[PDB]
Design a protein around this ligand. Structure first.
Ligand SMILES: COc1ccc(S(=O)(=O)N(CC(C)C)C[C@@H](O)[C@H](Cc2ccccc2)NC(=O)O[C@H]2CCO[C@H]3OCC[C@H]32)cc1
Lengths: 99, 99
């Protein structure tokens, strides 16, 4: 679909068997989800945003459905205030800022 | 134009007579620019992102040129790590997400 930006670009995602809402975020290199129960092994990572840094867990090769489009990639899990879908997954669903 | 997301969606802006680069940021409600010299009155504001909060100066009715598109609106100025163009200005230049 085409999505305009008068409101937050929120979409429905399915990940780890669970349904969540997340913001399509072109300003985010990586994908960051609030604390959730994911199955696999993870690695420590620290990521920086506008007000400082947070500790997250890095999960690779995670299947996520984003507004009906399947993608597999890295998902970071930790104390983000909002679920954000970053460019790493946006490119997979063919998302652009486009005409 | 169309912009894909394999790389950061950086564009050239002109504001306050100065040229800068900024990230087109669908995950940002507001526009936040790094410390710069901007004409006139402003108000204190506190904004939150991934790692906490920063203090910014809020300037209203500011003319900004974003990739050759003129817009007028609120620009926040403060210790953001990256110049970010948020939805407040993205809607003015007719910018959409598509996939
Ligand atoms: C390592 O991978 C990363 C590295 C960094 C990030 S990020 O989230 O911190 N960030 C990078 C940017 C600052 C360069 C993306 C950015 O879009 C961020 C995403 C976000 C975070 C928290 C709440 C809502 C939205 N937006 C942001 O901080 O917005 C501020 C400023 C603009 O106005 C408001 O809009 C809502 C909150 C407030 C993600 C993955």
């Amino acid at each position: 679909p085409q999505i305009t930006l008068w409101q937050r670009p929120l979409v429905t995602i399915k990940i780890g068997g669970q349904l969540k809402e997340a913001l399509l975020n072109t300003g985010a290199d990586d994908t960051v989800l609030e604390e959730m129960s994911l199955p696999g092994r993870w690695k420590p990572k620290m990521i920086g945003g506008i007000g400082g840094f947070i500790k997250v867990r890095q999960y690779d090769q995670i299947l996520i459905e984003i507004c009906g489009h399947k993608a597999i990639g890295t998902v970071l899990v930790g104390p983000t205030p909002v679920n954000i879908i970053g460019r790493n997954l946006l490119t997979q669903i063919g998302c652009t800022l486009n005409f």
